[PDB]
From Swiss-Prot, chain B:
GO terms for molecular function: structural constituent of ribosome; zinc ion binding. Component of the small ribosomal subunit. The ribosome is a large ribonucleoprotein complex responsible for the synthesis of proteins in the cell. Gene3D superfamilies: 30s Ribosomal Protein S14, Chain N. The modification Phosphoserine is found at S8. The modification Omega-N-methylarginine is found at R11. NCBIfam families: PRK05766.1. GO terms for biological process: cytoplasmic translation; translation. Binds 1 zinc ion per subunit. This is Small ribosomal subunit protein uS14.
Curated annotation (Swiss-Prot), chain C:
The keyword Manganese does not apply. Keywords: Acetylation, Cytoplasm, Isopeptide bond, Phosphoprotein, Ribonucleoprotein, Ribosomal protein, Ubl conjugation. This is Small ribosomal subunit protein uS10. Coiled coil: none annotated. Belongs to the universal ribosomal protein uS10 family. Its main location: cytoplasm. It is found in: Cytoplasm. The chain holds residues 17 to 117 of 119 of the full protein. Component of the 40S small ribosomal subunit. Polyubiquitinated by ZNF598 via 'Lys-63'-linked ubiquitin chains when a ribosome has stalled, initiating the ribosome quality control (RQC) pathway to degrade the potentially detrimental aberrant nascent polypeptide. Deubiquitinated by OTUD3 and USP21, antagonizing ZNF598 activity. Ufmylated by UFL1. The modification Phosphoserine is found at S77. One of its GO terms (molecular function) is MDM2/MDM4 family protein binding. It comes from Homo sapiens (Human). The keyword Acetylation applies. It comes from the Eukaryota.
Curated annotation (Swiss-Prot), chain D:
Signal peptide: none annotated. It is found in: Cytoplasm; Nucleus, Nucleolus. There is a cross-link at K30, K36 (Glycyl lysine isopeptide (Lys-Gly) (interchain with G-Cter in ubiquitin)). Component of the 40S subunit of the ribosome. Part of the small subunit (SSU) processome, first precursor of the small eukaryotic ribosomal subunit. During the assembly of the SSU processome in the nucleolus, many ribosome biogenesis factors, an RNA chaperone and ribosomal proteins associate with the nascent pre-rRNA and work in concert to generate RNA folding, modifications, rearrangements and cleavage as well as targeted degradation of pre-ribosomal RNA by the RNA exosome. A zinc finger (C4-type) spans 44-67. Residues 1-18 are annotated as: Disordered. This is Small ribosomal subunit protein eS31. The modification N6-acetyllysine is found at K27, K36. Transmembrane segments: none annotated. Monoubiquitinated at Lys-30 and Lys-36 by RNF25 in response to ribosome collisions (ribosome stalling): ubiquitination promotes subsequent activation of RNF14, leading to EEF1A1 ubiquitination and degradation and rescue of stalled ribosomes. Deubiquitination at Lys-36 by USP16 is required for maturation of the 40S ribosomal complex. Part of the 40S ribosomal subunit. Part of the small subunit (SSU) processome, composed of more than 70 proteins and the RNA chaperone small nucleolar RNA (snoRNA) U3.
Curated annotation (Swiss-Prot), chain E:
This is Small ribosomal subunit protein uS3. The gene is RPS3. GO terms for biological process: apoptotic process; base-excision repair; cell division; cellular response to hydrogen peroxide; cellular response to reactive oxygen species; cellular response to tumor necrosis factor; chromosome segregation; cytoplasmic translation. The modification Asymmetric dimethylarginine is found at R62, R63, R65. It is found in: Cytoplasm; Nucleus; Nucleus, Nucleolus; Mitochondrion inner membrane. It catalyses: 2'-deoxyribonucleotide-(2'-deoxyribose 5'-phosphate)-2'-deoxyribonucleotide-DNA = a 3'-end 2'-deoxyribonucleotide-(2,3-dehydro-2,3-deoxyribose 5'-phosphate)-DNA + a 5'-end 5'-phospho-2'-deoxyribonucleoside-DNA + H(+). It comes from Homo sapiens (Human). Residues 19-90 form the KH type-2 domain.
RNA sequence: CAGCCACCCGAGAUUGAGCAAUAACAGGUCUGUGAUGCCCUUAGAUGUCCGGGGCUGCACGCGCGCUACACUGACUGGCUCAGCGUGUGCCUACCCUACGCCGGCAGGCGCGGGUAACCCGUUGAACCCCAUUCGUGAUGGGGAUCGGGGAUUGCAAUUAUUC
RNA sequence: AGGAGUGGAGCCUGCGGCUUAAUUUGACUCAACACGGGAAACCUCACCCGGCCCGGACACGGACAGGAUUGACAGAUUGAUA
């Protein structure tokens, strides 16, 4: 019932649309990596995600991807699949939905934690 | 392939390898006139640098 | 042009003045028109350092100050004559920068 | 320093140790009644391979490790 | 290629401190007592006052050839253009680090602390010195830290 | 050390060109300040020095995060033996003395 | 008497600080150190090559301090006065930084200025110098509490951390 | 006698107990609490960790001379181009 969009465009349109007005759709992020340029050790993650995406099991989610690197991503080709992203000691499983575009993959890794639960007790009086 | 992969990431902003020039110590580095020491070595070795106390 | 400039800098004023007097006398030993020593403002370098290696006690600091005194001697002479005057066992800690233009 | 408790998976950083034959001939073939060699080992254009160093080609890609070449027949 | 006066003077101070530390930890057994640096046109001379000059020079000067071989490879001295000199200390009662190293290598050899301290005291006041304080702290014996003082003659304790 | 012996003998020759140099206290430094761009890892330089320390013919005078090499007559003899070369290559500093 | 208090001349009739005793502590620092004492550490090496979370948590008690509660004033802008300094460089790009074009916001290329009182600099500065709505308030004292966007040093700003 | 007045008001490295393993330290009388010259993607890391590597080298005994590294469009996926 309720209506959701990405300001008149979708992943298909943005795939057809060039980066010219994409920068106008870009909030502030992942623009200067083009001017800076991409470095080495950065050619296998795209290949791995595309290879996983090519074969998708029937009535089953795309195969889990174990990634130890926070890779900067420039295109919405990730949207429409699943990612196993980093938690700190395990790999947590993420469904990708239209909120991924307009955001970075590293923004789904939320990990922070208290010590233990307690109240000011016998030791602490003043 | 570590021989061609060694020292891949240039750590230029950090002072882990640019710490105090005396020993394996950090936590209080000062770059005034390019000392590259902590307070300890500077104060104990300030007599040879040429910095004297008459203020 | 033959105006040789000595930018001479040292930490001690007395050693600096002895060097300047010896140099200007060696110039005065020869027939060389010279200017008086020009005293550029001494650089006072401040380093205020906490004294206790680990933060404890009253907030106490040392203030190490570095006084750098610099004279210039520009004389109308070929630099070879000034170098002939130079071999006089220059005072240690007094460094000489040679300017020829 | 204190124990990090390697107790669940393999607590082993040791390298591999393998047993094999003293006379391992994989750069040549014997019992062939031939003084020459029919070249089934791939020609290596690197200036580090003579007649004692060659490569073996599998069904998946062409393996290397000396000069990073490719003789791909998949 | 010129550098500011403050930075060059701090570099000279760094260099001198480096030599001081290296020669103090290297030749303390051989009675190293001080390093001084002089400059001549395109030449650096280093004169090292030492209590034991025969032990700071070595046979045929070979150690010096070794010594310059070390320093020339640390601070940027081109090969063959640096020479090392040494003069006997005029008196061991005008420098404190000489008697300091003497105390080090008298206790390191195995010796009661008091004997070495009193030997130094009588050596100093047979040198015409006007006052000597040797404070020794730590564990002389047992497991407790007691600070002892060997104080001889008057000594100024404040002022310029 | 997963390092060829020929390069170790090359290090021995380069040292034998002198009597003692210094080493930078670091294992992540790709090259050597004296042997710049000669495929000499610093970590393997200290590997060599620690090996001859295990032998007991060399020592050090480490200062300001810098190893200070040493060499005794038996150590020089051992290096001139393993080099398989005549002892004629005396340090060039005596030729410039 | 040592000295204390007033007064005329005088620049000045107490300018401010670093040095500071004998002797000592069971005050903090082994998380400052290539200065170090039996235990876990004997290569199963609490960072060590690579490096992707961690002192980056919410209910409250007078812990150094922060902008204010206003009309001696924030506020259009008029006029114009600073002093210590810090400044292009060893695995140190990145330091200050005089104009054309553009770009409110940071910044692109150049002719150059700087190892230095030569270059910014005459730190034209900055507080104030009160001609503007302001009147006792939730608007202009009080940005303390929202979502978007240009982007420079930063592969990696996820708690728009910082322009 | 009196003076910014911090105390009284929402925003700080850290304090003392305070949600899913790591919010953790050393300093309880000023003379600890804007202190360790402390606003942390990374080395701001003293801290469950996911472990990429021996920077265990060497007297004396080895299946003693065929243990391994530089394998990068790969199916080889727990660093994939180790």
């Amino acid at each position: 019932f309720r209506k959701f969009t990405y300001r008149g465009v979708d992943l298909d349109q943005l795939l057809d649309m060039s980066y010219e007005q994409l920068m106008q759709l870009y909030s502030a992020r992942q623009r200067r990596r083009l001017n800076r340029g991409l470095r080495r050790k950065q050619h296998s993650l795209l290949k791995r995600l595309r290879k996983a995406k090519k074969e998708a099991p029937p009535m089953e989610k795309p195969e889990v991807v174990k990634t130890h690197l926070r890779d900067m991503i420039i295109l919405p080709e990730m949207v429409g699949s699943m990612v196993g992203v980093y938690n700190g000691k395990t790999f947590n499983q993420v469904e990708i939905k239209p909120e991924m575009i307009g955001h970075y993959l590293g923004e789904f890794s939320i990990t922070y934690k208290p010590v233990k639960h307690g109240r000011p007790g016998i030791g602490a009086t003043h | 392939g570590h021989q061609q992969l060694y020292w891949s990431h240039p750590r230029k902003f950090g002072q882990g390898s640019r710490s105090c020039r005396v020993c394996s110590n950090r936590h209080g580095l000062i770059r005034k006139y390019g000392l590259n020491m902590c307070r300890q070595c500077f104060r104990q070795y300030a007599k040879d640098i040429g910095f004297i106390k008459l203020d | 042009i033959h105006r040789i400039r000595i930018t001479l800098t040292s930490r001690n004023v007395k050693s600096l003045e002895k060097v300047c007097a010896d140099l200007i006398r060696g110039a005065k030993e020869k027939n060389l028109k010279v200017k008086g020593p020009v005293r550029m403002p001494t650089k006072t370098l401040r380093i205020t350092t906490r004294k206790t290696p680990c933060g404890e006690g009253s907030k106490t600091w040392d203030r190490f100050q570095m006084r750098i005194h610099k004279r210039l001697i520009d004389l109308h002479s070929p630099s070879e004559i000034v170098k002939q005057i130079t071999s006089i066992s220059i005072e240690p800690g007094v460094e000489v920068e040679v300017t020829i233009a | 320093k204190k124990r990090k408790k390697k107790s669940y998976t393999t607590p082993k950083k040791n390298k591999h140790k393998r047993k094999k034959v003293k006379l391992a001939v994989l750069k040549y073939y014997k019992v062939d009644e031939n003084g020459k060699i029919s070249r089934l080992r791939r020609e290596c254009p690197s200036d580090e391979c003579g007649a004692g160093v060659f490569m073996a080609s599998h069904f998946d890609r062409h393996y290397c490790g000396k000069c990073c070449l490719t003789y791909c027949f998949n | 290629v010129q550098i500011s006066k403050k930075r060059k003077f701090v570099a000279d101070g760094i260099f001198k401190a480096e030599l001081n530390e290296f020669l103090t930890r290297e030749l303390a057994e051989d009675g190293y007592s001080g390093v001084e640096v002089r400059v001549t046109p395109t030449r650096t001379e280093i004169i090292i006052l030492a209590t034991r000059t025969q032990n700071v020079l070595g046979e045929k000067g070979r150690r010096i050839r070794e010594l310059t071989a070390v320093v020339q490879k640390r601070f940027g001295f081109p090969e063959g253009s640096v020479e090392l000199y040494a003069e006997k200390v005029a008196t061991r009662g005008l420098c404190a680090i000489a008697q300091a190293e003497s105390l080090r290598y008298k206790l390191l050899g195995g010796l009661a602390v008091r004997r070495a301290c009193y030997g130094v005291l009588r050596f100093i006041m047979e040198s015409g010195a006007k006052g000597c304080e040797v404070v020794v702290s730590g564990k002389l014996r047992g497991q407790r830290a007691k600070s002892m003082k060997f104080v001889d003659g008057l000594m100024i304790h404040s002022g310029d | 050390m997963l390092m060829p012996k020929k390069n170790r003998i090359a290090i021995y020759e380069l040292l034998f060109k002198e009597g003692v140099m210094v080493a930078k206290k670091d294992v992540h430094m790709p090259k050597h300040p004296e042997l710049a761009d000669k495929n000499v890892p610093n970590l393997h330089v200290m590997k060599a020095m620690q090996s001859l320390k295990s032998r007991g013919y060399v020592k050090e005078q480490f200062a300001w995060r810098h190893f200070y090499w040493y060499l005794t007559n038996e150590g020089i003899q051992y290096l001139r033996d393993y080099l398989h070369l005549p002892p004629e290559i005396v340090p060039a500093t005596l030729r410039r003395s």
